From a paper:
The lysine 26 mutant is the most important to study structurally because Lys-26 is conserved in all shell proteins and contributes significantly to the interface between 2-fold related hexamers in the native crystals. Two crystal forms were obtained for this mutant using commercially available screens. In the first form, strips of hexamers are formed, and in the second, sheets with rather poor hexamer-hexamer interactions are seen. It is perhaps not surprising then that no structures are seen for the K26D mutant in the bacterial cytoplasm when PduA K26D is overexpressed. This results in the imperfect tiling of PduA molecules seen in the crystals and apparent lack of tiling at all in the bacterial cytoplasm.
It is one of the more abundant components of the shell and intriguingly can form nanotubule-like structures when expressed on its own in the cytoplasm of Escherichia coli. PduA has been shown to interact with the majority of the other shell proteins and, thus, could potentially act as a scaffold for the assembly of the microcompartment.
Author numbering:
A (entry chain F): 5 to 88
B (entry chain D), C (entry chain E), D (entry chain B): 4 to 89
E (entry chain A): 3 to 87
F (entry chain C): 6 to 79
Write the structure that this text describes.
Amino acid sequence: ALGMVETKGLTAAIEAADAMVDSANVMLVGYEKIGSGLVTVIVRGDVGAVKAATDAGAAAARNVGEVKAVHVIPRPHTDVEKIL
Amino acid sequence: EALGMVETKGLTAAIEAADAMVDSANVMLVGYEKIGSGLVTVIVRGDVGAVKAATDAGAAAARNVGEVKAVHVIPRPHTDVEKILP
Amino acid sequence: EALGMVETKGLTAAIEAADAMVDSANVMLVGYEKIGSGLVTVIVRGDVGAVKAATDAGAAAARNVGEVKAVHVIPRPHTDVEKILP
Amino acid sequence: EALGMVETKGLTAAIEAADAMVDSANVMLVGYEKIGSGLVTVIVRGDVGAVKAATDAGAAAARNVGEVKAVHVIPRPHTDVEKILP
Amino acid sequence: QEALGMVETKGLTAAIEAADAMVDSANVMLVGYEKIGSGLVTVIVRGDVGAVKAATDAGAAAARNVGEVKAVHVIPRPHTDVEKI
Amino acid sequence: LGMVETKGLTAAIEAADAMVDSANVMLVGYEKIGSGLVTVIVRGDVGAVKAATDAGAAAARNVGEVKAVHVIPR
């Protein structure tokens, strides 16, 4: 499963990442920068862990900065895997 | 041969469009491109009907996650365009 | 000989310009350049008449899908067309 | 060991925060990260009380030079967070 | 020679029209383009001071007709420390 | 350390050149952070830095926008 939390600002993103790893059995892949101050944090793991991680990351981050998106894909297509 | 693009503001929305597109239709995901200002384009190739179906599915899934800026299909792209694709 | 440029906000509009340019005239696609903030410049080259044709089609195609920031044609020595490019 | 962050718009504002942080308490400067759009994050590491003290001092100092966007402390961060630090 | 000339535009199209006008107008070397965000691009040339002044005025005037010129400047003999950026 | 931060690169290069020309400083940083912001950084004795940054800022204002001018002793 794939979990993403997207924030305005890097400080909110670091807090999401920490909360995600604190809250569930997930691997933190990293983050991506896309401009306009937006930062996407990415984690992988089984679907229940990714759901628990993204819900915890999004809730933590909101108190540090603005949360722009939160999403989980339980079983990404292989073509997606290839570009992640 | 057709080319389909969904451009979102936000990378979470683009990834959700990419996955919806490949899931929805017989299309190959070519890749994504970032150009700044939060803008991310995801590109698919396939027969024309498959790419219209993919891009409409991608755009609809993206809108539930984030913002869609642009959706377009070029049904018969010139061979030179392949040079600039991800 | 000339360079022709169409600069858009958005990559979808830039790819639609690119394909429309090479569809409309005997020009070669050089590629495209990103400067951040969603701004992309698609560059073609060829004979001056063909580049003028191409950039008129490309800007129109891009304005149908998105925003065009600039469209311009620069005549160049036929022995060193690309020397000024980034 | 605790991590402290001050995010500013503008680099001068950030370097001022860094100087203020390291002077104010027993903290190690981890580094700066840039995310574009003029935003820079300065990070320090130390014991939690030292980190709260530094970050306070850094933000106050930065506000006199530029704009402060975020100030935060994580008291007991996981090792994994390193993957994403400068 | 060693004078430095700079023309800064909003937009890459105006920068490349500046470079064409610059190299056409005088004996100068195009060093490159620098992107710094907010859509700003700087075009940098080197040459003797007379070539660089001519090149820079020609670039600024040519860019002004395609887009917006943000800065235009010539440094006849830059310090050695500056050569390092 | 002395810093001059500008909106525009041309103004930045002019500050750097004016600073090093005006005082006993060495150019030790040149950073881009986006949104057009460029910082040039010098090192020397406090007084040479205070006069460098003064001179850089003044020279850069004739060329473009200056956003910050700052001196950190130590």
